[model samples]
Every structure is written in structure tokens, then in C-alpha cells.
Target chain A: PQITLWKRPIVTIRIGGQLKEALLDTGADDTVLEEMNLPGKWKPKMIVGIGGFVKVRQYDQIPIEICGHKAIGTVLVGPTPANIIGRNLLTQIGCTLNF
Target chain B: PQITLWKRPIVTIRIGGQLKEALLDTGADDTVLEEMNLPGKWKPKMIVGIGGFVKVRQYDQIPIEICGHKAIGTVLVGPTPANIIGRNLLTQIGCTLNF
Candidate 1:
């Protein structure tokens, strides 16, 4: 399959009263969240990957209104830097590439 | 929703003549390969995560036939500890918990 590339400015959105700047990526199939930035009330769950299984925390997907666009999706908790905008969210908003 | 926990022994597999021991984790949703363990043929691609856009390498999924089980899935290349067997593979084989 031919992979696509895209670059967009970092955008900050509020989740659980905290602000984070996440890079928008079109390649990722799902929404992923950094563990450290994960909000309270979310819990860690096991997820299977190539190596085996690793524990991942799940959090609510916050409503992100960007450049007049809005969408919601689950955040997979990880370390700092917060979550990136993935295909799930992008597909809903109709992403476009700007040269 | 109730979360379940299962522990399994770590297994070593050969990828490009190198052996890697990866723990079986049901918590992880995707097959993640440690950055250090990535093979030469794999190339990095941008992936969306919580923090933002990060480069992730991709590799061919080798056929893993273990304990009368076998499956295949793409390995997301990362650092050491190699790849983890994720849900994509486990679900296909009908994984079971051993007491």
C-alpha cells in the first residue's frame, strides 16, 4: 500500500481541565494518548501488540473544535505530549492537505 | 465494563536471525516493536499518538507457530524487546487463559 504524509500545525485542546498540543497525523488508524496527560477516572487496560501485551489506559475522547472543525474519539493513555489526531477523527472532519 | 487480567510466559522468536523475548500482554491493542529491535527492511512512517505525530517503522509479520497456535500480523517497528503479539493475532487463534 502507498502511504500518505501530512503536516499540520500543533493544536491544543482541553481534556479534564488540562491543555495539550497534539500533532495531527493522518497515517495512524486510531487515536492514541500519552499516559502522563491522561485524565482522572480513566483506567489502564491490557492491549495486545506485536511484542506481546502491554497495559494501556483508556480515557474519554474530548471534543476538539479546530479551525471550525470538531470531532470526538477515545484516547489511549500513554506518557506526555497528549494525543494525536488520528484517522477516526480526521475521517469525520474531512481532512485536506495544503501545499 | 470489567477488565480481565491474564499472565503468560515470555517467548523468544527469531526475526532476521535475532531472537527476542516478548511478554504476552492482552492489554495492548496493537503489535508494538521496540525501536531497538526493528529489522533493517522496515522503514519509519509517521503515526498519530496522544502527544502528537511520531515516526513508526513497519515490518513484515512473520508466521508465529507456537504451542499449536499460529497467526500473522504486521509488526510496528520500535525499539528493543521486539514485537508483542496483539489482539489481531490472539483473537484469530482463540486465545485461552491457563490456570
Candidate 2:
């Protein structure tokens, strides 16, 4: 599927039996989700955004499905404004930017 | 051009005759760059991201070339971790997300 930039590239994703709308953020280095529960222990990490850095719970090898495409990668849970699927997972789903 | 998500989609852009690398951020609503002088008067604005909100100077109708694609839109200047080309400008350049 191809998505135009006329609007935010938000897409439906499934994780931990939950469905949520996430932004396919090419600019992000790692995926970050709004505070949610996932299996396994997580490590504390910090990520920098447009404003500043925020602390997050980093969980490794989490499986997620973005628009039906599958990917398993590191997922960061934090108080993010929105769910963002970044390069780490985008690559696994073969997501790309085109013009 | 098609850019895979194997790495960060950083592209070279020309603004005010200055070359800088910016991330093609689909998750971002507006373009934000590090402190750089842009022409004309700007308005004070605040933007929210994963971490928190930041103050910036918004310059409208600024001409920019991303990877040789031309566009003119509002640009924000502030203390950002990385230069970002958001959907506002990406739309003007006909950028898209594909998988």
C-alpha cells in the first residue's frame, strides 16, 4: 500500500491483542508507544524528540503488526503523545518513503 | 526516489543557501530545525512531541529544497535534536509512505 503525505501517515496496528493507531514515523529511530502493559521485564531508556528527552521502558523483541504487515523489534513504552512506528520496526515490514 | 527504512531517512535540504541534513518525519506535524537564521519576521510558537513541548520561532512561506524537490511552507527554528522535514513540507514535495 502507498500512502500520500496529504495527512499524517497514521495507520492501524495490533500489539498484545490491542488495536491502536500509530504514526509511521520515518524520522524516529525506535518505536515508542503510549503507556501500556507488555510481557517481560523492560529496561529504562531515554529518547530525544523535537523538544527534549523522555524516559521510557524498553522491551526487546516485541511483535507488532502494522497495517497487516508483521514486525518484531524493540518497543519503547512511555508517555508519548502518539504511538510511533519508527525505522527499527519499519524496516522489518519493508516500509519506505517514496516520491 | 524510494527510501527504505533500513536506516534513518535523512535527506539533504537547501534553505537560505545553507545545506543541512533533515529527517523525513511523517510523525511530525511541522518542520523543525536547529537554531538557524531564517528570513523575515517570525512568530513565537510551541510544539509538543514525545517528551514535552518546546518554544520555537515560526517562519512562514520559507523556500526549501529537499533532495532537489522544491517546497515553501512554515518552518520552525528551535533547539531540536535533529533537523526534521515534516508532513507540511513533505506534502508539497509529493512524498509518500509505501510498503
Candidate 3:
């Protein structure tokens, strides 16, 4: 699948048995999701990005399905304006940037 | 060019005759550059994203060369963690996300 930049490159992702839309972010180093309840424990951590830094709960080994591609990695739960699928998970699903 | 997600997709961009490396961010709606001085008057605008919001100076019709592709559009200058070439500029360069 190829996604153009004319609009936000949002894709459907299934995480924790819930379907959600997430932006495929090449700029972010780590994947972040809006506040959601997940089964298991998470550690408090701070993530820094374009805007600044924000404290979030880090959940590891979480399974996520992005555009039908299954991937498992660290997912940060935070008060983010949007759900971002970062490089960490993007690589897992063989996502790339083309021009 | 096809860029893999193993590393940050930083590309060379010529802006105001300065050569800088910027990330091709599909998730960002607007281009945001770290602290830089540009000509002309700019209006104050606040941009919201993953972390939250940040005050930026919006300069219109700024000429920027992304990987040899000529592009001119609104550029926001602020204290960003990294220089980001968002959808506004990415579309100009015909950049897309592929899997």
C-alpha cells in the first residue's frame, strides 16, 4: 500500500482489541497512543518530540495490527493529540518512505 | 528514493541558502523548523501535536528545496526538537508512505 501526503497518512490499527486510527509518523522515534486501558503493567517515562516532552506510561510487548500487518513493540500511552505509529512499529511492518 | 525505517528518514533541504537535514514527517500537518532567522514579518501561531502545543512564527511563501525538489509554502520557525518537513512540504516533493 502506498499513501500520499496530500492528506494525513492515517491508517487503521487494532490495539488491545480496539480499532483506532493512527498517523504513520516518520519523525517520531517511538510509537505513542492516546490514553487507553491495557491489560498489564506500565512504567512511567518521559518522551521528547517536536513540541516538547510529555510524561507517559510505557507498555512493552504490546501487539498491534497496522493496516492488517501484525506487530509487537513498546507503545506509550499518553495525552497525545493524535495516535502516532512511529519508526519502532513502522519497521516491524516493513513501512518505508518513498519519493 | 526509498527510505527504510531502520533509521530516521532525514533528508537534506536547502532553506534560505542553508543546508539542513530534516525529517520527512507524514504525521505532521505543517512544516516546523527549529530556531532560525528568516526575512519578513511573521504572525504568532500555536501548533498542537503529540506532545501538546508550541508557539511558532509563521512565515508565508518560504522557498525550500527538499532533496532537490523545489517547494514554497508556509514555514513555522520555533524551538522544535528537530526540523520537520510535514505533509505541506512532503506533498510538494511527491513523498509518500509505502509498505
Candidate 4:
């Protein structure tokens, strides 16, 4: 499928039997989400962007469905303005950047 | 063109006679870079991403070349691990997401 950046890379996702919207970010090394009720053990981590970093609660071995594709991996939860699907999850869904 | 995410969206960029590798990030609202000598007047603004926010110096009306595609816009510079190309620049480059 052809991808267009006329709009942000916003997509639908299903996690823990719950549906949510997320932004697919290739620059981020990990996936980050707004505060949510996730059940699991996650290591405290610092997810960093250019000028700043934020604390996140990582939920590991969680299943996430992005645009009908599925994968299980670590997801970071924090006070993010929105849910972000990073490289960790993008790879599993066969995401690519093209002109 | 097809963009494959099997690898990080690492691309070569040319800025002010300097060539560098920058990560193409759709999650980022603005392009960010490490400390560089850029000339322009930029308003001081806070950029918030997944993890946190950082103080950055924004340079206005700057020209940047990504993957050989030329674009002029506001670029934020600060202490970033690497140079990141954001949606502001990506839209000019015909970039998109695909499944």
C-alpha cells in the first residue's frame, strides 16, 4: 500500500483487547503511549527524544495490533500526549518509509 | 519509491555544506539536531515528544537537504543524540508510511 504524509502517520491499534490510536514514529527506538491500564511487569526506563527525555513504564510481552498487523513486544507508558508506535512495533508490522 | 523499515530510517542529509546522517521521524513535530552553527532568527519554543521536553534553539528559514531532496523550514537545534528529520520536512520530501 502507498503511504502519504499529507497527514500524520496515525493508525488504530488493539492492545489487551482494547482499541486505541497511535502515531507511528520511526525516530523513536521504543514504543510509547499515554497513561493506560496495562497489566504486566516493566522496567523503569527513560525514553529520549532530541531536547528532552521522559520516564515511562514499560509493559513487556504485550500484544499490539497496528493496522491489522500484530506483534508482541515492550511498550512504554507515560504522560505522552499520544500513543506512539516506534521502531519496535513498526518492524513487526512491515512498515516502510518511501517517497 | 518504497521505504523498507527492516532497517532504521537512516538517510543522508546535507546542511550548510556539511553532510550527515539523520533519522527520519514521523513522531516528531519538528526537525531537531545536535548543536550546530546555524544562522537565523528563531523563536524560543518547547518541543514535547514521547518521553520529555528539552530546551532547543530554533533556526528559522533554514535550508536542509534530506536524501537529496531539498526543503526550507524552521529547524530546532540542541543536544540531540542524532539529527532527526520531522514531519515539517518530511512533507516536502514526499515521504509516507506503508504496510
Interface RMSD of each: 16.2, 0.9, 1.1, 2.1
In order of the candidates, what TM-score does chain B achieve? 0.54, 0.97, 0.95, 0.91
Clash number by candidate, in order: 40, 0, 0, 2
lDDT of 3 by residue, B4-80 (tens): 98899899999999999998888889999999999998999999875678899999999989888898899999989
Those runs of model 2 whose alpha carbons end farther than 4 Å from true positions after fitting are none
Top candidate on DockQ is 2
DockQ values, each candidate:
0.04, 0.88, 0.83, 0.66
Report lDDT (Cα) of residue A57, candidate 3. 98
Instruction: State the lDDT of candidate 2 residue by residue for B1-99, as single tens digits.
Output: 898888788889999998999988998889999999988899999999877889999999999999999888899999898999998989888888888
At residue A96, give the lDDT of candidate 1. Answer: 35
Local error of candidate 4 at residue A88 (angstroms): 1.3
**Predicted structure 1, TM vs. truth:** 0.37
Give the per-residue lDDT of model 4 (tens digit) for B1-99: 565665778889999889999888888778998888887576777776544577788898898899879888889888778888888899888888877
In angstroms, the error of model 3 at B30 is 0.7
The DockQ assigned to candidate 2 is 0.88
User: Could you tell me the fnat of model 3?
Assistant: 0.88
Q: Candidate 2's residue-wise lDDT over A16-97, tens digit each?
A: 9989999888988999999999999899998988667889999999988999998788999999999998899888888888
Q: What is the lDDT of residue B93 in candidate 1?
A: 54
DockQ of 3: 0.83
Docking class of 3: high
Cα lDDT for residue A10, candidate 2: 86
lDDT of 1 by residue, A1-99 (tens): 111221233566555555666654433444566655544577676643222454667776655553345566666665434356555555566553211
Kindly list the per-residue Cα lDDT of model 4 for residues A1-99, writing each as its tens digit. 555665777888999898888888888778888888888577888876554677878889998888788788889888888788888888787788878
